[PDB]
Every structure is written in structure tokens, then in C-alpha cells.
């Protein structure tokens, strides 16, 4: 109930929300069915349209008009946006040459440059080039301001998850908006696009920018607009708020357009019907910039033109049906479409079994257009697991496809020709970013970046301290002329030990053997030099990683590799080695096939043992520095040390051996040498963060050897590939991955074939940022380079996507 018989007179688009049953007049009252009786009349005036005409110039103010062309309109803040153009000989903003905005040029009384966020739904990245002819205002912002070729959304590449990520800098698993549609079980409640539940604050976690601003005394325009409020009216309302007295005027505003998403669903991303919605968005930008110019604010406000996700060609005939795979199809509930999420229809059903549902959907048709995952097995770069609203079973759907439960769901629920939601690395899902204004750089292109980074920058633009978030603060400093945040490297928490030779061979009882008893002060001083770190500058090119938590670990030096060996987890946390372009691959000599050697620098009590691997019928082992890449037959013995060994399932050893034997050398050949850092990851609670020892759910049978959930590698070389990786004078280039450590290769439908047909495709899917590995390990990389820290932060957020050119 609302006693909607008060009035909006002098309260139109009021900024403080009123509590029931006093009637509301804010830009969201329609959506709550709570506006005062006279809201349309007073606040949604439409008379005479949105543009001044010659004959309206100097008119007598008629308060009925949607906007004004009267002499007093500028000081009242309510002229039509084209007023000065039509009535005062002025040019449209788009027709003016751009001129560098070196300092903010604001009216007296402005304490900071305002921020206007202009968001556009479904604005795919390639529209910037493909629609350029019809979007002159947008093309001017882009070419004169700061822009990226594209901006990566979050997964799922849906509307609410991405808009709320923009607002909070958090992954959807952390902010809680994990789809356009969701079920929470603690609430026992459902969130839907239509309906009232989506309004309860309990869905919306984190701290969005408007709240961050408000808490720190920066005033915010209300961000959300009722759908029926036309765009011209949203623009005029923003412009009117910008004319409020200093103590009442907000510093941050949002505009939102439903286009081009709305038409894109109907006509597909490049349908001929799409030219008009792009024209109409551009004209709205034009109205904003014209209105700002009239108010002498076009060189004062920072404008962000940003999309939430792109749009792909998707039609009814490209739908996979779970009914074609499953017999129990009514014992399940499917969140369908461009992703799939599956749960049990009834929790009173103890017959329900996820493992047989997964098996029933795995590699069942040759051209199958989705792949099932338990959520913890999804690629870690998606960060899509640590929420009770994300169902244990997930379907990653091929681009251009849908998944549904039964065919009846599709003809009783072809309309649509476009949709979105797919893996956030898919080119069609990429969206846009342009920053224009005194705080952004002038005519500057920046590399593609992720939308989780923008919250920190918007905070910087407004002088706010950001709430804790998933951006890497400083990684987008290169977007900014001023207001940069000067990040600093985290302090190392644990310092390493540097053990020397402290144990005799016979003190070990590990059940390991090696055929290594083949017996010179030339090569004896030399081997001693290597063990003390004489070659360390070669294999550790960016300094040793810092350990950011409390633990006990040793640095171990070798001719070919250096490692930081954990006495707690009984294996390296990291192993670092360089492979030059000229390096040679060799085989494991026959006599050394099962060779494992005690390490006389490390106690029996802090070592793994071979007997546990013998007894564990499921678990085998691999090596972090690969024996295949040894620099000499003598150095090869170092690779068989028990301190270089890690637990590996045989199914996983297929992947790992191919990477180490074939792919490392291929990368060194292609990139002119590479530096590799590899190691284990433990994330048994799938929160994206390093596990403590008490979180480990799996050990090599009968031992305290913990089993990794994943294995990572970070592969760095010179951006200028004419310089070898080990003598690089400038910026670096990196690709990384986090491979799931799985006891089968069910994820790879082609795994019965030779590794050359499936391994690299798997590794591509599990591409990762350095930063993702940092969260998962408590390590901090690139501590000693010749590069500025902000550049290194950019490097750490880089993701190698393997997509073709946009
Ligand atoms: C991406 O960035 C984000 C943000 O920085 C990172 O997320 C943070 O990670 C921290 C570590 O996991 C986490 O810190 C914990 O917070 C607990 C208090 O949490 C509440 O308060 C905060 C602050 O206002 C609030 O933001 C939280 O919001 C969550 O929950 C609400 C509703 O419950 C949601 O609306 C919201 O979306 C959000 O949900 C997300 O996070 C939770 C976890 O909090 C997930 O479960 C959800 O799925 C979802 O992802 C909360 O309202 C605090 O109680 C914790 O303290 C325990 O552990 C510490 C260790 O220091 C220990 O000292 C304590 O003793 C304590 O243990 C006790 O409780 C245990 C659990 O009940 C129990 O087992 C013990 O036996 C003890 O009784 C802890 O400090 C922080 O909350 C989140 N923040 C957010 C917004 O998610 C994220 O990690 C980054 N991701 C990556 C990949 O880097
Ligand atoms: O058309 C859609 C829609 C629905 C389902 C779809 N499937 N596929 N495409 C779809 C498009 N919808 C839903 C709601 C409503 C209409 C729009 C207004 N809204 C906000 O006003 C907002 C703005 C927000 O933030 C804007 C700030 C961050 C910059 C946030 Cl967080 C949430 N909602 C987001 C959209
Ligand atoms: Ca964890
Ligand atoms: Cl969804
Ligand atoms: K075994
Ligand atoms: Na397989």
C-alpha cells in the first residue's frame, strides 16, 4: 500500500528516497508503483518535444513544455539541449575540433570534476568500428579521449551480473548477482527479471559506487531509471541536477540505455535493423554533450561510455535439449539459455545423483555444443563457484547456441536472433570503454582490460577510498592524466632459509632409488657454485617471488632451476627456470626412468617419499623442472631430486609431460627464450584463494603429502621478441595457465588421441592472469624488474585469450 495522494510539485526527481506511505517522485517510483498521482503531469512533461525550433527562441516560458527555449532557461537549468545552437549561433559539441583538456575547466563552486557514467546494454566491441559512420558523437569521445579496443565483461556475460560488477569491482560470485535468474537456498527465495524479489536488498552484496560515494560525503544522482522514462527526459534530469546549488548537487551520475541490447536480441548483432538504435544512442550522447557545453561543463565533467557485454548470433534451431541426453529429465531444474545451471527439482529426493547427471552429458554426440562441469572444475579465470546461488552442475555452452531442458520449453515459454551469456573470453561478448574528460588522457589507446578494474578508477576519479574489491588498484593508472593511485608492493611476510648440505644419504628412508653411482676439481668447484646460486640470475629473471603469508620454506639452487621449497606442503611453492631459443630437448636416459634422489639439503622429515606413491594406486608423480630440459647429462640428476617431485594423476601426467616435453620448447622457439615459473595450487574450497593446510581434502595415501587441485605456469619473455628473454631491456610479455589436476581427462572429448590433438586446446581454455595465480598461492611475482610498478600491475592482470583479432 501507498497513500499516493500527496504531490510531486517541486519534488520532481528528488534525490532522497521517501519512506511509505508518503508518495514518491524519484526516477524509480514507477517501478515500485508508488509515484504521487501527479508524477506524470508535473515530472514527465512532453509538450513540444525535445528540441528548440527557430520560432521558440526567446519565447515566454510555458511551464507545460518538456524543455524551454525562453531567455531564462540557462539560469533555470532547463533549456532544450540544442537551445544555444538554434537560438544563439552556437555549434553542436560534435562539430567542434577537439582540444586537449589539460586541467578541469569548471564553474565556481565545483569542488571536483563530476563523473557521468553512460552505460549501454549489449554494446558489442566491434560496433565502434563497424557502426562508426553513424555514431559521430561517440566516435569523437573515443578518438579524443582514452579508449580500449575492447573491455572484457565478467562471466556470465548477462545484464545484472555485469552492471553490478561495474558498480562494485567484484566478481559475481562475491557480489551475489550470479545470473539474470537465480535461486538462493538459505533465503529459500528466487530472483527473477520480472517481479518484486529482485528489489530486496538481500540479493545485492558488496558496496556499489553510489554507496561508497555517499558514505564518504560525495553526493550521487540516483543511478536507476524506470524503463518508460524516455532517454531525452533522463538526460534533461541529469542536466537539471548539474544546476543544483553547490551543497545539493551530486558529483556522480549514471545514464543507462536499454539499446542496443533490446534490438540486438530481435535482429542479431549486425541485423540491418541495428543501424537505427546506434544512431539513436549517438544522438542521446549528442544531447548530453550539447547540454554540458551550454552549462560550460564540457571541459569539466569526466564521461565514461561503457557497455556491459556484447551480442552473438543465436537462433531457436541451435538449441541442445537435455531431454536428448537424460532419462530422468523431470527430476532436474535447469536455468537455461546461453549457459546452463542444473539442480535437483526436490531436496526430499535422496535418489538424485550429480555424478550420473554429469556422466550422462559428457561427450555424448560428436558435435555436442555444451560441456558439463562440476562448478569447482570450471576454468579458474571465470571465478564462478564460491556462491550458494551457483548450482554445483554447470553447462558451458558453445557460442551461438542455447541449452534447454525439453523442446516444449522452447515453443511454449522463432523470436530472437541474438543473445549473450557465454564465456567472457568470446570475441562476440566483448564490450566497450571510452573515458573522456580532464582526468582521462588525451587521444590515448590503452590495452583491453577487465570491467572489474573500473570501480577503483571511478573511486579515483571522485577522490574516494574504494571498498575492498577484485580489481588490482593501479593496473589502470595508465588511463589517467592525474589522480593516479600510487600502489606499492606488498611486504614479504616469510623470509626463506638457504640450507646447505646437512644430511647424509643413509639418513633417508624414503623407499626411493636412483641409478646414480657413477663418480676432478674442474667440475667439483663448478657444481658447488651452482648449488650456492651462481646461475641464479639466469633462471630467476624478475627476482624471487615474495611469500605473503607465514610459513616455513627453503630456497634451493640448481644449475638449471631455482625453487622455493615448502617444508609444510613438502613440495615447491614455485620452481623458476629459463629456456633460451637455442635450448635443446633430450630424453630421460633409460637407466634414470624411475630415478628419485634424496636432497641432502632437506631433512627426511620434510621430504616426500617414494613408498607412498608405490602404495597409492591412483596417484603417480611428475617434476616441476622437467628432466627433458636439463642443460647437460650431469645437470639432469638435479631434476630427479625428491624436492622437485609433485603428486600427479596418470591422466594428468599426459597433459603435463606434453607441456614440459613439447610446448615449453615451442614457446622458447616462438618467443625467443622463455622464463617459466611453475608450481602447485590448493583450492579445495573453490574460493579462488590459497588453502591453509587444514583445508586440504586429499593426501597421497598414507602420507602427509597434500594433493594439488591445480598446477600453474607463468611464461614470461621480452615484448620485443628481437631481444632474448634473458636480456630484455623493456616491457615484458606473459601467458599463464592454471590447469585442473584431474584423475581423468573427461573434459577433453578427444583425449583418446595423441596429446598433439587435445592438450594445447585444454591449456587454452585454462588460460589465466598472473594475478589469479597470486590469489591462489599467496605469492607476489615480478618483484625485481626495471619496469614501473603500475606497468607490472597491468602485466599481472593480462589474460592471453587465444581469440582471433576483434
Ligand atoms: C574478491 O574480492 C572480495 C572482497 O574483498 C573478496 O571477498 C572477501 O573475502 C574475505 C575472505 O574470504 C571475506 O572475509 C570474511 O568475511 C566475514 C564477514 O563477512 C560479512 O561482512 C562483510 C563486510 O561488510 C561482507 O562484505 C560479507 O558479504 C558476503 O556475505 C553477504 C551475505 O552473507 C553477501 O551479501 C555478499 O555477497 C558476500 O558474499 C560473498 O562472500 C561470502 C564470504 O563472506 C561467501 O560465502 C559468499 O559465497 C559470497 O562469495 C559478509 O556480510 C568474516 O566473518 C570472515 O571471518 C572468518 O575467517 C577469519 C579469517 O581471517 C577468522 O579470523 C574468523 O574467525 C572467521 O571465522 C569464523 O567464521 C567461519 C565461517 O562462518 C567459521 O568457519 C569459523 O569456525 C569462525 O566462526 C572473513 O574475514 C569477505 O567477506 C569477502 N567479501 C566479499 C564482499 O565477498 C574475494 O575473496 C576476492 N576474490 C578473489 C578471487 O580474490
Ligand atoms: O532490458 C533488460 C534486460 C532484461 C533481461 C535481459 N536478457 N538479455 N538482455 C536483457 C535486458 N532489463 C533488466 C534491467 C532493466 C531492463 C534495465 C535497467 N537496469 C538498471 O537500471 C540497472 C543499472 C545498474 O547499474 C548501472 C550502473 C553500474 C553503472 C544495475 Cl547494477 C542494475 N540495474 C538494468 C536493466
Ligand atoms: Ca581456497
Ligand atoms: Cl542467468
Ligand atoms: K601410484
Ligand atoms: Na576424454
CSV table of N, CA, C and O and ligand atoms in Angstrom, one decimal, residues 363 745-752, ligand 6:
chain,number,residue,atom,x,y,z
A,363,UNK,N,30.5,-35.8,-23.5
A,363,UNK,CA,30.9,-36.3,-24.8
A,363,UNK,C,30.0,-37.3,-25.5
A,363,UNK,O,30.5,-38.3,-26.1
A,745,UNK,N,40.6,-37.4,-18.0
A,745,UNK,CA,40.5,-36.4,-19.0
A,745,UNK,C,39.2,-36.3,-19.7
A,745,UNK,O,39.1,-36.0,-20.9
A,746,UNK,N,38.1,-36.5,-18.9
A,746,UNK,CA,36.7,-36.4,-19.4
A,746,UNK,C,36.4,-35.1,-20.0
A,746,UNK,O,35.6,-35.0,-20.9
A,747,UNK,N,37.0,-34.0,-19.5
A,747,UNK,CA,36.8,-32.7,-20.0
A,747,UNK,C,37.2,-32.6,-21.5
A,747,UNK,O,36.7,-31.8,-22.2
A,748,UNK,N,38.2,-33.4,-21.9
A,748,UNK,CA,38.7,-33.4,-23.3
A,748,UNK,C,38.1,-34.6,-24.1
A,748,UNK,O,38.6,-35.7,-23.9
A,749,UNK,N,37.1,-34.3,-24.9
A,749,UNK,CA,36.4,-35.4,-25.6
A,749,UNK,C,37.3,-36.2,-26.6
A,749,UNK,O,37.1,-37.3,-26.9
A,750,UNK,N,38.4,-35.5,-27.1
A,750,UNK,CA,39.4,-36.1,-27.9
A,750,UNK,C,40.6,-36.8,-27.2
A,750,UNK,O,41.5,-37.0,-27.9
A,751,UNK,N,40.5,-37.0,-25.9
A,751,UNK,CA,41.7,-37.4,-25.2
A,751,UNK,C,42.3,-38.8,-25.5
A,751,UNK,O,43.4,-39.1,-25.1
A,752,UNK,N,41.5,-39.6,-26.2
A,752,UNK,CA,42.0,-40.9,-26.6
A,752,UNK,C,43.1,-40.8,-27.7
A,752,UNK,O,43.8,-41.7,-28.0
B,6,LIG,NA1,38.3,-37.7,-22.6
